[PDB]
Amino acid sequence: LSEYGTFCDNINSILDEVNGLLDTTQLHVADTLMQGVTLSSNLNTNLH
Amino acid sequence: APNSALAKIQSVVNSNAQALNSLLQQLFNKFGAISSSLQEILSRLDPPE
């Protein structure tokens, strides 16, 4: 497998880039959900 | 300062440079052959192998 030396590093790099892209996308989605959200401290979901 | 926009631009450039370096490095892989150099193949062996 070392005679194909670049191969497993390339696959690992591509998968790592894909997974980091998924993580960045999840962070962006969470930021969009939480963007500009202001809630009161008095807010109690068990009663309201 | 280490801001995200310049990081993104340099990431574009560095990703391109890494992809080209990786493609160039594929010329020095052997893929199971006795050598990665076609000169070595054509000098060390007669045509059938």
From Swiss-Prot, chain A:
Function: Mediates fusion of the virion and cellular membranes by acting as a class I viral fusion protein. Under the current model, the protein has at least three conformational states: pre-fusion native state, pre-hairpin intermediate state, and post-fusion hairpin state. During viral and target cell membrane fusion, the coiled coil regions (heptad repeats) assume a trimer-of-hairpins structure, positioning the fusion peptide in close proximity to the C-terminal region of the ectodomain.
Name of the protein in question: Spike protein S2
Organism field: Human coronavirus HKU1 (isolate N1)
Lineage per the UniProt record: Viruses, Riboviria, Orthornavirae, Pisuviricota, Pisoniviricetes
Parent sequence residues shown: 833 to 880 of 1356
